[PDB]
Design a protein around this ligand. Structure first.
Ligand SMILES: C[C@H](O)[C@H](O)[C@@H](O)[C@@H](O)C=O
Ligand SMILES: C[C@H](O)[C@H](O)[C@@H](O)[C@@H](O)C=O
Ligand SMILES: C[C@H](O)[C@H](O)[C@@H](O)[C@@H](O)C=O
Ligand SMILES: C[C@H](O)[C@H](O)[C@@H](O)[C@@H](O)C=O
Ligand SMILES: [Mn+2]
Ligand SMILES: [Mn+2]
Ligand SMILES: [Mn+2]
Ligand SMILES: [Mn+2]
Ligand SMILES: [Mn+2]
Ligand SMILES: [Mn+2]
Ligand SMILES: [Mn+2]
Ligand SMILES: [Mn+2]
Lengths: 429, 433, 421, 421
């Protein structure tokens, strides 16, 4: 089935085909002059996939308020349908990341719907940072590292349930992000809390299938405002190393202290074989969860420069999981996810253009200016023609958002789904 | 009316009276050796008040979740009852700051309940950062600075209504904090947005009584994650200077960029007569809204040092409004507000101990080391005995939290109020299907 | 000609074919977008940014300085090196002088300038360090020092800078001081600012009718607790207090972490106090790195505000543009060349923004298309425009490549003695 | 004695009465709290922190240096000044040396130290600056430099630092380098770290059985884009990779804004890699200000982890303590005196924490009472304990007051030639 009429896609592609041919041919000639085969780049670009977050498909909100748009998805099934659109138009998002219990539903049905939509499932995400109705033990003071044994046991059991759901739909990994921490000095004993967390994660690891990976995600702060158990990549490395070969670290771009050199963290985790994957998004102040590359596109390019360098250096067994983790508070979620996926492919494409041999020479000779200019020559290259052609060749849209709007999809689901009501956030009752 | 049994207060005071006498006399002797009359300090401390936020009386939450405790207040009336306790035990929070429409109710009933509880009302707070039921225009893309004229008018009208409610209950100021801004470069034109905001505020200003003040509150980010119209004190000054004499700037401690020297901003606003008031709280990362002084007590003291210096040298009827703006996500809201109000008095009392004459000398002398030590001599002084004695002499408790727990108040209201249910924040929408 | 014309000609010819192809390709793409590449190139070739005399020699940190070969011996060698930057990029006709570092006979400075085809931008005073024969030290401050005599000495220094500038063609004085405190209590914030305001008021009195006085804020360094002129808010208060000739200078690396610098630029423009810019890039503090080498988008967003100002018809808006960088690990001339290039690059992209479309997206609160409208301009590779602008004006298609081909560094290395002490 | 004993005696008697009143009052308050003030005083008397040889001279920034009077020149002058701090505070018996700045005949150094009653803490190598005659420059790095010969030179220097230390009684080598990049692409993050690890392994091999090797991480400066040993994570990787004798050194001012430093301390302790501390305070970057002058609670919170670690009986826990500060606007000796005082102040307050009560509030998730439990200790004015500890060990009740009364600064000013006066 096609969420977007194929005739609309065809029409909107033909409308822009001429210009694209001109832009692609021009870029091809320029790249050829630079000793690069544009065809080889396009080939790799059409193979780069990033998973879309189920929680980013509906309108997001802050602790102050939520302003839903029209046709908000009612649940996971509506979210999958909307994800199908993103994949149909960008062809870069074949897999969806589920979050439990937000996406709780019959696994068999989820798989059925996914297969029918041409969508797969990436890493499962557990939720022990919030309480569900009827929950026996509250996670107010923590979960996997809570002082109460019964509470830690409950959190561990929930994670095992996520794994069971994942095994039924085809997922091969579990991502664990918890809010565990403290808001006041002395509230928690840093070491004992970490010990409790490590012991609980060990139980999860014990129940982890041997064809699965366990990703732990660090975050400097929020919901905890004084200390956080898994606060940075250093603690994260200790966790992954301690748990086992199947445990790795997940890097969410917005979870670092101000001015942190994140691409270096990426390089370090790769060197020690603990880079499990990414949660892509952009930010300017905190964990803003904004559209990838919308704030600092060069940083995104520099992260991908480390990933490509890894391949260039000959690193093996390196297949990090790529996922988008964003919240869309003031835009049409589908459009933002479409362009964010595009931006990630944009950074990847530019990273592929780096003349590795030239860069290597300038680094060895300590020619800092030419070294940086070598990266800039790749980053300054407008690879949109490549991104658009990759989409066109694989069944997608030359201009995804334009086609999305021309299809009238949003108004369509707005009529099929109940209206929404704006409200406040979690700051007060 | 006494939320806390007088017999309990008296009992818990006598239980700690002997120790307090010893500590107070010891501190009194130490200060005397330092040329300071402890009684003069205690007298000023007893008179220092900070307003409590009604929205801080209930348990707070984040965008990820809310974990309510037992006996959660149902509405403004329950919250007023709970604030009565903070004031009874600390004697430092006689006034409550209201938020509309969260606390919207008959002004006569509000004023009536306040008088019965011995509570007054501080500045009103408007809410155009969220949508209410039946609202004609959404504030999703802004309010007072929204591109849509009808939306700006609705926001201005809401604020004018806040002034009306405030006039009826005894409030004398309106604090305006909005989320207006953008999440993406290009989404907003910085200049046009600010011009729209200034025009809208001008209309609100026209509705201010002669003895009222309009406080604009700056914030670097959140809910807007790229730009915010009223992002810092610089823009805040431009606003206040443009609007008029009744318009001043409100400084919320957790609303500044990392490493900002906040005490300097306070001094600058005082110098130009635009320091409207404060929203006290503490933080380490962003606008954490944590208990005042729980993270960086010295910073709080340094802010009060600027306030006391200005006071010491008599300045233009200088009377900034002191208010607490905190969210309590992992503690009993009443206990945190009690200790937060205590910390604010602690920093004030310590600031009063600074030898101003000596400090001035070291400053003109460029004796950096002795100047900083002059402040530290005051800051290092444990003034808890003064704070406790001030409370004891005015009908409060020597150890407020201890008395609060001994009274069993939380269990009491918990049995009177409906049970609450933990849930998520506004990060994602409902998902029942 | 610091760089032999035959070398510039040879290197341009070697790259002419590729430039032709890229420029024409870009031209057709822009035409399809409703933009006339010639109109953009005509504006770019006229965008100038002043080069800092103090950035022509190798810089250093408090830990060490690692000079390269042929370091300029003084201001005259520095002007000679600046002549290279201008000849190759054609984007830096003016130089920013710093007194007393560049103190010399005004007549001689001017003669070397005219001889090289260089002019002079804003003068820069120096009361953040002590010079020989100084009656009062600036250890504890300068224009805001508690000692009246010290403030007077600093005022006189600034007036001398104005006298030197008037003689060479300058039309402005930039004032950056380190005044502040390293400990709470050391300074009375308000009295320190009042002292500064009184001192600046005196300097303002020495300003010719057509001169400007720029005050530059900085969050910290050298002061590590408080700084008198710490941010744009205090800077605005200064400019507003002093008068029409007083404006604020924004140095990109002088703001708190995560600050929205482009908004500060917009705010100052709205109130007519944006005097000028000190361009550079950074990641941690006031790193003074090559412009756009770390965050090229931020640079573009700043220029987006500058071009919007013109779009909105702001009157008498002529900000001074200057580079303020230190080069510790590269050939200063090459970094200044590419930095000037980066600035013109961001400017050119700002010119490509479809302001009509953007205005529409802003009014309809279409956040996604509004940001995409900015990105459509920023993602455009304008290098062909920059290179064509240089070709037309006597510059080099590839400045650094032509610079290296000329062997200029090796030449001056043999002419200039390295300092031994 | 650098400071006449009769002066110390006179200034102690002058403040003896008030001290007695405050000590007895504090003694009674602590008694009511179940603590014996005598036990705390005994412990404080035994807490020592190393003073940096490079801290007794006046410091500066990249913009300027404003030396005071009696500036010590050379390690011998510096040792004489360090002796004053130890005599008056009795908290700094050991000095940290930096090579080549303090290079001198080991025998003479050891002899001067013994004569002044000073020992020697960890040695500090210097490959972040070039010494005259040096064969290879450290402009682009040292231990991680791309050039093999440069790395070997850096390694040899560190080995020489170990040789010097062994001769004077030192038992550890601290390695802090500026290695990194100022531009993206300039360095290959991974390869640079690999080179560093290989070089450090060579240094590790020259370590005596009873020696420790400390690596010090730093977010930035002198490198403004990336730094090889940028944070504690990389630092842990270095220590774990090198072996049991290698540990991480934590300098309070070397972390990203808002970093929770006390947590890093806890994590390093848990994994047995907390080698030591470089104490100082800051507000913006690596400001190197007097310990506790900006954020005293943070300092107390770091000590809370240290004291908890002992209370827990953690193995491999025996960190070194050193002050690493720069004094640009105060008398270096007075600042080091009060900084050592602040460090003992934080230690004393941490000792007052009711560990039993705290543990209970943590287990029951009583966050409010848990933090108030820490505050009860931190709010306690322990000055009487610090003062009595000094009085009892040959020091001064009020160190700075005695120092000033002694006229020491004027004394050395009359013995040492300033650049100009
Ligand atoms: C939804 C998801 O669990 C969540 O966003 C985490 O990955 C982390 O980014 C939270 O800040
Ligand atoms: C509830 C109140 O309006 C709010 O807290 C504001 O004062 C401001 O702090 C928001 O960040
Ligand atoms: C050299 C020049 O005065 C200086 O760079 C100032 O402009 C300012 O950037 C200092 O941080
Ligand atoms: C002088 C000493 O080696 C130096 O201060 C290092 O320890 C580190 O702090 C540098 O930033
Ligand atoms: Mn995430
Ligand atoms: Mn997140
Ligand atoms: Mn507030
Ligand atoms: Mn707030
Ligand atoms: Mn500058
Ligand atoms: Mn600067
Ligand atoms: Mn150090
Ligand atoms: Mn340092």
């Amino acid at each position: 089935e096609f969420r977007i009429a194929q005739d609309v896609v065809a029409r909107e592609n033909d409308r822009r085909a001429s210009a694209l041919k001109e832009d692609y041919e021009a870029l091809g000639a320029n790249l050829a002059r630079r000793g690069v085969d544009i065809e080889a780049v396009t080939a790799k670009v059409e193979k780069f996939f990033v998973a879309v977050p189920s929680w980013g498909v509906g309108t997001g909100g802050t602790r102050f308020a939520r302003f839903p748009g029209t046709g908000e998805p009612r649940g996971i099934f509506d979210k999958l349908d909307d994800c199908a659109v993103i994949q149909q138009l960008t062809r870069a998002t074949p897999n969806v990341s589920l979050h439990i219990p937000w996406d709780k539903a019959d696994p068999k049905e989820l798989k059925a719907r996914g297969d029918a939509l041409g969508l797969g499932f990436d890493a499962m995400n557990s939720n022990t940072f919030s309480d569900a109705p009827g929950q026996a033990h509250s996670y107010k003071y923590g979960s996997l590292s809570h002082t109460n044994a019964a509470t830690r046991a409950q959190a561990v059991e929930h994670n095992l349930e996520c794994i069971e759901i994942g095994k039924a739909i085809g997922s091969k990994a579990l991502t664990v992000w918890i809010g565990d921490g403290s808001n006041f000095p002395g509230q928690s004993n840093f070491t004992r809390a970490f010990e409790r967390y490590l012991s609980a994660m060990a139980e999860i690891y014990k129940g982890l299938p041997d064809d699965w990976k366990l990703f732990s995600e660090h975050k400097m702060y929020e919901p905890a405002f004084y200390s956080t158990v898994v606060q940075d990549w250093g603690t994260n490395y200790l966790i992954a190393q301690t748990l086992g070969p199947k445990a790795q670290c997940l890097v969410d771009l917005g979870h670092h202290a101000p001015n942190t050199n994140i691409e270096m963290i990426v390089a370090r985790l790769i060197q020690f074989g603990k880079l499990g994957g990414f949660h892509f998004n952009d930010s300017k102040y905190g964990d803003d969860d904004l559209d990838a590359g919308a704030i600092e596109p060069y940083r995104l390019f520099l992260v991908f420069n480390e990933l490509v360098d890894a391949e260039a250096r000959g690193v093996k067994g390196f297949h990090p999981a790529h996922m988008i983790d964003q919240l869309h508070n003031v835009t049409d979620p589908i459009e933002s996810l479409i362009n964010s996926a595009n931006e990630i492919r944009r950074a990847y494409a530019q990273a592929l253009l780096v003349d590795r041999a030239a860069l290597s020479g300038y680094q060895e000779d300590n020619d800092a200016l030419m070294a940086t200019e070598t990266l800039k020559r790749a980053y300054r290259t407008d690879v949109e023609p490549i991104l658009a052609e990759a989409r066109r060749r694989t069944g997608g849209a030359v201009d995804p958002v334009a086609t999305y709007r021309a299809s009238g999809y949003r108004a369509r689901v707005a009529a099929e789904r109940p209206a929404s009501v704006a409200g406040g956030g979690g700051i007060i009752g």
